[PDB]
Amino acid sequence: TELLKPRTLADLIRILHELFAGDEVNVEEVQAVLEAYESNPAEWALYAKFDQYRYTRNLVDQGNGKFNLMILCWGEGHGSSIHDHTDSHCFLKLLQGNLKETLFDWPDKKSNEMIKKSERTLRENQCAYINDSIGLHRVENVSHTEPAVSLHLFSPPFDTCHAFDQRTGHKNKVTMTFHSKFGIRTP
Numbered sequence: 001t002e003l004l005k006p007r008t009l010a011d012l013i014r015i016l017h018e019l020f021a022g023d024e025v026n027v028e029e030v031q032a033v034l035e036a037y038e039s040n041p042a043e044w045a046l047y048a049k050f051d052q053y054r055y056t057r058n059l060v061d062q063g064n065g066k067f068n069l070m071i072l073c074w075g076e077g078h079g080s081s082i083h084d085h086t087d088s089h090c091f092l093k094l095l096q097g098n099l100k101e102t103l104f105d106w107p108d109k110k111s112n113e114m115i116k117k118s119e120r121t122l123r124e125n126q127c128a129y130i131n132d133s134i135g136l137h138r139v140e141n142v143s144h145t146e147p148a149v150s151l152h153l154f155s156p157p158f159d160t161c162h163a164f165d166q167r168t169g170h171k172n173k174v175t176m177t178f179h180s181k182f183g184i185r186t187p
């Protein structure tokens with residue numbers, strides 16, 4: 001599979017439709033092409049719709065029936081739950097700012113504190129990857145001064161996941177909602 005550098009976000013999307021044309025996913029190739037796209041704010045401004053109070057999920061492309069590509073917009077101090085990814089691949093590329101990713105193991109059945117296994121700072125243009133076999137994660141914009149924007153690819157698409165209570169490991173199902181689709185706010 002000949003991987004070329006995406007020239008623009010639209011070019012990236014076209015390449016992703018090629019990489020997901022089939023039934024399986026070459027994770028390292030997808031991550032490499034996502035990393036190789038150099039974030040250009042003008043190309044994704046349409047999708048980068050923020051909310052004052054929490055991070056937003058903005059659908060960019062529905063894929064070929066095979067993936068959701070979305071842009072998440074994180075105000076200062078906004079972060080996620082500890083969550084899984086519903087048996088899907090998750091790629092996360094930073095378009096602007098920085099995000100802290102904290103990794104957790106799947107809890108045991110016993111109620112116990114969830115102790116982080118590691119953390120890392122994801123920086124502009126870097127692409128991280130996670131799936132349920134790797135573990136769970138929390139993603140947070142810990143900046144006090146800089147909003148963050150990330151590009152997420154989920155394959156297959158999913159609209160529910162679990163949030164985990166860090167104090168006990170207990171999980172609850174959450175339905176994920178789109179703040180916008182294709183540049184259009186969807187209340």
Ligand SMILES: [Cl-]
Pocket residue numbers: 090092139152
């Ligand atoms: Cl995520």
Ligand SMILES: [Fe+3]
Pocket residue numbers: 083084085090137139
């Ligand atoms: Fe995630």
